[PDB]
Amino acid sequence: SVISQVIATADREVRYLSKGELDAINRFFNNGPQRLRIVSILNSNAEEIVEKGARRFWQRCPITPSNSDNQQFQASCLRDQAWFIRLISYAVAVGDVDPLEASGVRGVREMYLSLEVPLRSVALCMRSLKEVTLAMLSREDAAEVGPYFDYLIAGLMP
Amino acid sequence: MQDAITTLINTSDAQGKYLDDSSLDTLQEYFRSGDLRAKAAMTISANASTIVTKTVAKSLLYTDITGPGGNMYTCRRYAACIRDMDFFLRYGTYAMLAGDASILDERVLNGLKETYNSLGVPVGATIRAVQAMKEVVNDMLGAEAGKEVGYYFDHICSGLS
Amino acid sequence: MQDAITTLINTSDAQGKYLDDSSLDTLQEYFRSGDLRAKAAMTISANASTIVTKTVAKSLLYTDITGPGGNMYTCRRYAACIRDMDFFLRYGTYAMLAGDASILDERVLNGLKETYNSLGVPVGATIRAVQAMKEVVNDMLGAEAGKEVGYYFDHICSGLS
Amino acid sequence: QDAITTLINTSDAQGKYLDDSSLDTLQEYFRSGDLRAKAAMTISANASTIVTKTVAKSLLYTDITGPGGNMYTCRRYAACIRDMDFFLRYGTYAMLAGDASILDERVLNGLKETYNSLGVPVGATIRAVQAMKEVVNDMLGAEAGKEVGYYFDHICSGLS
Amino acid sequence: MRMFRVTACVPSQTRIRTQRELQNTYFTKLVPYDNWFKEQQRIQKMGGTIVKVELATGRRGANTGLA
Amino acid sequence: RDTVTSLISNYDTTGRYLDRDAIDSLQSYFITGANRVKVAAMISANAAEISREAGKKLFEVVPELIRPGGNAYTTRRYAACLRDMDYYLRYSSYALVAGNNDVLMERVLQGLRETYNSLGVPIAPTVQGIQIMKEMVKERASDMGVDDTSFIDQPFDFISREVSEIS
Amino acid sequence: DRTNGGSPVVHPQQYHTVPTAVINGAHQRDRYPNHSEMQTLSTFLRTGLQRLEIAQTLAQHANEIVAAGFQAINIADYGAVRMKRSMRDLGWFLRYITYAVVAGDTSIITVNTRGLRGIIPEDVTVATTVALQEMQWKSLSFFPVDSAAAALVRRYFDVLIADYQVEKPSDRYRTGVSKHDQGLSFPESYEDSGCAIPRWVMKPTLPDSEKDAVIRAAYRQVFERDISGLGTAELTQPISQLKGEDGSMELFIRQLGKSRLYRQLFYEPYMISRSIELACRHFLGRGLSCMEEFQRYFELVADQGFSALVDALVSSQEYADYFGAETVPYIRGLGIEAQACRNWGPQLDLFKYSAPARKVPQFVTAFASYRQPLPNQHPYGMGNDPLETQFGAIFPHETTNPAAQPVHFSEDSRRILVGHAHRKSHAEISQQIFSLQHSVESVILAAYRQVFGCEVLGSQRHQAAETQLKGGLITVREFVRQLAKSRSFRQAYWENLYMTKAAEIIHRRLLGRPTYGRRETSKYYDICGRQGFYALVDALIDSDDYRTAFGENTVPYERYVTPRGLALRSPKGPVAISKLRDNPHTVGEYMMR
Amino acid sequence: SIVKQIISNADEELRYPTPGELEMIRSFCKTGASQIQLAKTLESHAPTIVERGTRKFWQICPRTPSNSGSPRKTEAAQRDMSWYIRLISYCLLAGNDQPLREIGLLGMKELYTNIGIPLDNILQYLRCLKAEAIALLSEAEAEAIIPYFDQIIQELVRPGPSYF
Ligand SMILES: *[C@@H](C)[C@H]1/C(=C/c2[nH]c(/C=C3N=C(/C=C4\NC(=O)C(CC)=C4C)C(C)=C\3CCC(=O)O)c(CCC(=O)O)c2C)NC(=O)[C@@H]1C
Ligand SMILES: *[C@H](C)[C@H]1/C(=C/c2[nH]c(/C=C3N=C(/C=C4\NC(=O)C(CC)=C4C)C(C)=C\3CCC(=O)O)c(CCC(=O)O)c2C)NC(=O)[C@@H]1C
Ligand SMILES: *[C@H](C)[C@H]1/C(=C/c2[nH]c(/C=C3N=C(/C=C4\NC(=O)C(CC)=C4C)C(C)=C\3CCC(=O)O)c(CCC(=O)O)c2C)NC(=O)[C@@H]1C
Ligand SMILES: *[C@H](C)[C@H]1/C(=C/c2[nH]c(/C=C3N=C(/C=C4\NC(=O)C(CC)=C4C)C(C)=C\3CCC(=O)O)c(CCC(=O)O)c2C)NC(=O)[C@@H]1C
Ligand SMILES: *[C@H](C)[C@H]1/C(=C/c2[nH]c(/C=C3N=C(/C=C4\NC(=O)C(CC)=C4C)C(C)=C\3CCC(=O)O)c(CCC(=O)O)c2C)NC(=O)[C@@H]1C
Ligand SMILES: *[C@H](C)[C@H]1/C(=C/c2[nH]c(/C=C3N=C(/C=C4\NC(=O)C(CC)=C4C)C(C)=C\3CCC(=O)O)c(CCC(=O)O)c2C)NC(=O)[C@@H]1C
Ligand SMILES: *[C@H](C)[C@H]1/C(=C/c2[nH]c(/C=C3N=C(/C=C4\NC(=O)C(CC)=C4C)C(C)=C\3CCC(=O)O)c(CCC(=O)O)c2C)NC(=O)[C@@H]1C
Ligand SMILES: *[C@H](C)[C@H]1/C(=C/c2[nH]c(/C=C3N=C(/C=C4\NC(=O)C(CC)=C4C)C(C)=C\3CCC(=O)O)c(CCC(=O)O)c2C)NC(=O)[C@@H]1C
Ligand SMILES: CCC1=C(C)/C(=C/C2=NC(=C\c3[nH]c(/C=C4\NC(=O)C(C)=C4CC)c(C)c3CCC(=O)O)/C(CCC(=O)O)=C2C)NC1=O
Ligand SMILES: [Cl-]
């Protein structure tokens, strides 16, 4: 969130929250309800987002552990899609990527290397998830949500 | 560093003068470019690795700078060049989003030329590849925001020449 | 760090005499085990990433330790567990190549129980993961070298105990 | 400590009498107390039923109850059911006292270390505890449940 | 190991040094290769004008043997 | 962690999505945010007055601290105590902006009792002065026009509760 | 409620005398005081005659001095409290002048006076300086001003007036180095009171002895002690590159860090985390501020070794901000900068010269376990928890390898213990009971193996109690009490033991379970401290828990343990914590479909 | 500025600016026209505030180096105060307090104690300017610029705000 880091910045160069930072968090508090309503829409659409995104991911990437004949790998992948959607809704609710960075970006590359799951394939799945979510959301709702998808993708795009 | 707002404030403050109408309209232009500058910065943040991959593919691969005796031979040097490119792209993102290229002047171009001449890193291939990166971001961002980040890619190219 | 030769010399130096005959017999045992020690360390060095991967796959995946509220949730913590297993494997390989578990006591075991209780890291699940690692390392080197390094894995489990 | 005791201890460190805002918090406790005693009555009456529906809605028919699972081996299912009784009774203590000090003083100290030494799944326990919170909320109304679930979330936060 | 001979002057812009915290800023310093990238970034972060970077030790184009 | 990130982290650790209780709590915090920013502004404008006058009131009510036996006798210790007052006021204002005591948890209560026992600093005048700060910010918030003084009540009470002993 | 980082003994310096400053300088240079420092001490002790008699005459005439002490204010308009504070301040200023005269240093005046311009309401500062000038005039009026020490009294009063005329001096700031690092502020009075620390700056044109002093201070910072006298400091190429025109103090700090001397001292005997904390001491002059700093360091060491950690510490922004290029790192403690409360205990145990005496990493344990609930620990720390073996009171020594995590439990807090009753079964725990295992002799032997976990020698047999129980004169409970009141039991569990440790181990042997909380432990410790050992034994045998569990005819047995005890009693791990995944399929080996 | 602080914080961690930083930038750019108009009101009305504040401060405090007979000290006092309001307008346009701190709070007390101006009289003069700026501009436009007046004020009341 912007408010935690502006607190940390005021803490570092020791002072109080100056008036410009106060207007910044005022605009954050004013934009709160819209983030809440789009979070509610994402919670309503999360399951169908996972289904359509997995279908498009297998269309755009058939050689994957999820698309193999092993359904444990497919179930783990679908669980991963749902988990990243939940974390992205967390990021939308917070207004920055702090739940996303804390839970599913920091160390996600090391995990999927330890799982041998190709991180380009996860990035493509999150691309398809982004397309499904932007299709399922309004233009301004897409404008809010798509950056968090971009930041989840870029966290594994390597 | 300086951004657009800080260079305007600095130019007025080094004169004992409030910001004037030309400065207020220049700051207005900055404010109305802010939305697409933020969107372009997010697009680059998403696609940085792809940018660097395509840039090195179309400007620096399958030439003798890659094979034996080349400067990009011996994989640690290729990785050093790729690190240089991630830094170039992120600092161009900083310059384009901040509105001023002063971040480039005080964190790239100070020291970069003498380091490259100290190491034998060819500046001309660096500049050609950096403008290929500019062309890539032109290709997949659009004409307007692509040119906006391309201005600071031009500054990186000029400051290395 | 006291390896087998070093701790042997230390016993004889505290006793003040030269290495007695039985101590030379144990040093002969170490000196004829050293070739298979080097080969086992060679294979662990080659396949360390695979060993940790299959070990976590057989002891830490698909349990509630990886679900929400489990300690391996929140990807950075999964990576922390991977790097702890890497520390366990590399330091057990050091102890096997050295012929004594002093590197395990000094670099690993001397306060890891305090740190794991402080962080809330599962001690019992780490012990199960280390025994699973002993099984995995046992599987692709064979019985002799496998138990020779599983002694040090069991030492890790005893020091976590 | 209970809510009155925390208020008295905050005042007594200053060495003064309870002030007006602390008197207002005393009013809040002294007009929540009736529904606290009623919720404690109903929870004491239906503790076994709450624990049963808790285990059913969260812990059953997953491999935690199967062979190899932590809740296999009937004595371990008994120990899990007994921990659930302890969690519900201590949540009732926290709700009646108004403070989670009884939770931190008798439940949460060394429980993470104990469970993690024994290998008890922490995340499954937090899941079952929130399920028990759902059971209490559903069969006591949101009116009562918004209090007891606060201490259940205290147990969940301390466990995680 | 290959060394960089670096002359730079790094100014302070966030703190007033009282009388003892003042040290110097114009340093000429032998820099190891594996740290020179981070030292260049650090003295660019603090705002230093780097006036002189040369290769003190080692040659250019070394495929091996440079450390 | 503010209220938003704390509640989000709790639901992340249990694996649930956002239910309507969370949406209501988040909207409640977002509505109270205007008052929180107003109090942060008044605090940033009158912080030196609030902290120093609370120190003065504490030394009037607890006379011994400025007396030679007390641990705020000389002006070195007096300035150290007033700087501690500014510390408490600044981090309580941070918590007022955030609405959560995580900032206090990690940056005020992270060893305060150990420091105050090492230096001989009395705990109970420290929390008495914290309460004087809280009553001061309460009364100039009421004069400023903020009817809900509940928000500004909580960080000082949290610091007092975590710092004070058990009688 | 939260775990304790330790409250170490701290002595904050309020000022400096003349001997304290000289000894501080000599100590901070690691040497005997030299001839000019000797002349400092001897000349000040020579003037001590004049200084003590000046203080004598000023204290003797203090009443008239402050009676004598712009627009003179009115008593009624000013207020009674403010008049009282005016008189108190005036007598206080005179007292501190005499304090300075005896101490021979104006550090007390300068520290306690310089930032007083606005503390005193600053509309009475003209009145304040006029009163101080009049006190100077009067003090010199009855102390003859021709060529005597009235010049000294004039100088000290002038210094007091000069300090008081100094307006608002800026507080020093320890700015936060990262988002996780809190920024701290620091009064200049606290800065000037703090002990002077030498700032060893090495310039290329320094003389050789000054350079060698800077080298020795670099050894004292990094290697914690002077190693130059030893032949281990043979680092002739790093020293030689450092002395002349190149290889500055930062590169030399890095070369000291990556040397095998540093590895032998602070990396070879330590795990990675303790090594990281010691490196933080030796290269930045401070401990770990926060957990996230430690995460950065630990991840970096995990993928790149400890030498890269040294490279990152000496290549950091904080290093160049404090120690720059050619300043030796110095320890940043109490009065050097503003201290955080976050790492107070670990960092004051780290700045102490006995920081290598601790092996368990103090910073990470405190930082992590503050964000965790209360641990399973005896209420008076973990040293009071004995080792759960058959026999032997084995407690962790507070001095030998201190692995101490202090924790405050409430009086009503209770320990969670793993009972053997719910575990296992019946006819599995009734094999370890030994009631009335029907032979008397076996019950005597089992009562021994409870009271002393192993069978004892003949000299430790309480044969009179054997005859009493074989005759039926006393029951099993009285026999256990007599065994616990035997001399050899006192030697085994009471004499060579800390008293609460002794009480806890006697409770474990006579009750078969650890204590629960401060209720029980407080009562036993109070009993054994006001009444003694036999009183505690009688109170434990006549404890209601003994009667409910072991009754009168049953030998005590272990019933509950700490969870650490079972973790010791399962070195292969617990039995079945989650179903294993024998013959699993992982990606990569599956993908080669 | 806001973009300056975000770029510095992002380059510290060697990372691209997050979506929340870009939301902060876009919100500030949305309010940019409003803040420009705030600065416009400040530009128009600054000399009146300076002259009324200097008259009021001279009346409330005659023992003042500007109030001493020299014209250059007087001109320097007006110059300093107009410079401070200039930095406040800079703070309005940048979006944070960087151009007050960096261009005149950092090292200000020691600057004036080297100059010889008493800082309590500076505090009173700034209090006077704050009063006439409150009474002069408007109500809503005061809420944007008077907090920065409080920020420059709060740096010099701290030897100790006086009580009994
Ligand atoms: C009035 C408040 C009481 C009082 C205070 C007092 N404190 C100290 C010294 C210190 N105070 C702190 C505090 C903090 N550091 C932090 O990081 C935090 C959170 C931001 C806090 C609250 C510290 C660390 C110190 C040590 C010195 C330092 O400045 O770093 C003193 C001086 C101690 C001495 O004798 O030297 C005093 C006087 N004293 C009273 O009597 C009041 C009850
Ligand atoms: C799906 C998009 C891709 C894919 C996935 C895949 N994942 C696994 C296994 C795991 N994935 C996780 C995930 C997370 N841990 C976290 O903490 C978070 C963030 C909050 C996430 C998303 C975990 C924990 C596992 C381990 C198994 C478990 O749940 O315990 C697998 C299985 C690998 C194996 O060998 O079992 C797979 C296949 N597969 C694809 O094809 C996609 C690219
Ligand atoms: C073959 C085993 C795998 C594989 C090969 C592959 N490589 C490339 C492209 C390049 N490979 C290199 C390699 C090196 N440069 C060095 O300095 C060193 C050490 C001496 C090495 C090994 C380079 C520089 C390139 C870039 C192209 C160039 O040489 O100019 C490709 C082409 C990829 C593309 O799409 O362009 C391929 C296919 N591919 C596999 O699947 C194998 C596992
Ligand atoms: C890539 C486009 C070209 C290339 C690169 C290359 N660079 C190096 C070594 C260094 N490059 C730098 C870079 C920077 N310094 C700065 O301050 C900035 C920040 C904006 C940058 C980008 C530095 C510091 C080094 C030396 C330290 C280090 O390598 O970490 C090499 C290696 C040279 C060698 O001898 O090993 C290479 C190969 N080479 C090409 O051919 C491209 C045109
Ligand atoms: C993996 C098998 C299990 C697990 C691991 C886990 N560990 C941490 C965190 C840390 N682990 C250590 C360990 C060590 N310190 C040393 O010096 C050595 C070297 C020999 C070791 C092994 C430390 C110090 C930490 C803290 C620093 C860090 O986080 O990297 C975590 C994260 C805890 C947290 O709260 O972030 C985890 C998850 N967890 C399991 O569930 C596995 C059974
Ligand atoms: C059949 C003779 C009687 C009966 C059975 C019944 N059982 C269940 C559910 C469970 N029973 C068990 C059993 C065990 N767990 C253990 O650890 C041991 C030791 C090996 C045993 C015997 C378990 C685990 C379950 C839950 C299912 C699971 O594995 O998760 C039910 C269903 C109850 C419900 O509400 O679903 C039933 C019906 N019912 C009768 O009427 C018979 C007398
Ligand atoms: C049930 C929700 C989960 C579960 C439980 C489980 N617990 C144990 C064993 C113990 N649990 C405790 C805990 C407490 N004792 C107390 O007095 C209190 C009240 C404040 C608590 C919370 C203790 C001390 C034990 C050991 C003694 C005993 O036998 O119960 C087990 C047994 C584990 C084993 O036998 O190895 C189990 C199964 N397990 C799950 O999987 C559920 C998620
Ligand atoms: C003999 C081969 C070596 C040796 C032994 C020695 N031991 C002690 C003292 C104790 N030994 C123990 C051991 C145990 N307690 C248990 O519960 C078990 C099983 C888990 C064992 C093995 C204990 C607790 C003690 C202390 C109390 C007691 O003496 O009963 C000593 C005495 C040392 C002293 O100072 O008391 C000695 C000498 N010494 C050697 O040199 C041999 C290598
Ligand atoms: C050098 C010894 C020393 C002194 C004299 C000192 C000053 C001091 N006096 C102080 C204060 C005052 N001195 C004075 C008075 C004077 N101080 C003087 O020396 C004279 C001549 C005057 C003007 C009449 C007043 C009115 C106060 C107000 C205190 C308040 O604000 O409540 C204080 C604050 C603590 C307290 O109230 O006790 C301090 C710290 N502190 C020190 O360390
Ligand atoms: Cl003298």
Author numbering:
A (entry chain I): 2 to 159
B (entry chain D), C (entry chain H): 1 to 161
D (entry chain R): 2 to 161
E (entry chain S): 1 to 67
F (entry chain J): 2 to 168
G (entry chain K): 3 to 71, 149 to 515, 539 to 695
H (entry chain C): 2 to 165
What do the paper's sentences say?
Far-red light photoacclimation, or FaRLiP, is a facultative response exhibited by some cyanobacteria that allows them to absorb and utilize lower energy light (700–800 nm) than the wavelengths typically used for oxygenic photosynthesis (400–700 nm). To address these issues, we have isolated a FRL-absorbing PBP complex from cells of the marine cyanobacterium Synechococcus 7335 grown in FRL and solved its structure to a global resolution of 2.78 Å by single-particle, cryo-EM. The fraction containing the FaRLiP-AP core complexes also contained ribulose 1,5-bisphosphate carboxylase oxygenase (Rubisco), and the structure of this enzyme was solved to a global resolution of 2.35 Å.
The FaRLiP-AP core structure was solved to a global resolution of 2.78 Å based on the map-to-map Fourier Shell Correlation, although some map regions were challenging to model due to preferential orientation (see Experimental procedures). It is generally shaped like a cylinder, ∼85 Å in length and ∼95 Å in diameter. Nineteen subunits were identified: eight ApcB2 (β-type subunit), six ApcD5 (α-type subunit), one ApcE2 (α-type subunit with two REP domains (Pfam00427)), one ApcD3 (α-type subunit), one ApcD2 (α-type subunit), one ApcF (β-type subunit), and one ApcC (core linker). Other than the ApcC subunit, which is a core linker protein that assembles into the opening of a trimeric AP toroid, the subunits are arranged as (αβ) heterodimers that further assemble into three (αβ)3 toroids. Trimer 1 and trimer 2 are closely associated, forming a face-to-face hexamer, and trimer 3 is more separated in a tail-to-tail assembly with the trimer 1-trimer 2 toroid. One anion was identified and tentatively modeled as chloride, and each subunit except ApcC binds a single phycocyanobilin chromophore. All phycocyanobilin chromophores are covalently bound to their respective subunits except those bound to ApcD3 and ApcE2. As previously suggested, these chromophores should contribute the most red-shifted absorbance due to the absence of a thioether bond from a Cys sidechain to the vinylidene moiety on pyrrole ring A, which therefore extends the conjugation system in the chromophore. The chromophores of ApcD3 and ApcE2 therefore likely serve as the terminal emitters in the core complex, linking the other phycocyanobilins in the FaRLiP-AP core complex to the Chl molecules in FRL-PSII. Based on all these considerations, we conclude that the FaRLiP-AP core structure determined here is missing one (αβ)3 toroid with an accompanying ApcC subunit.
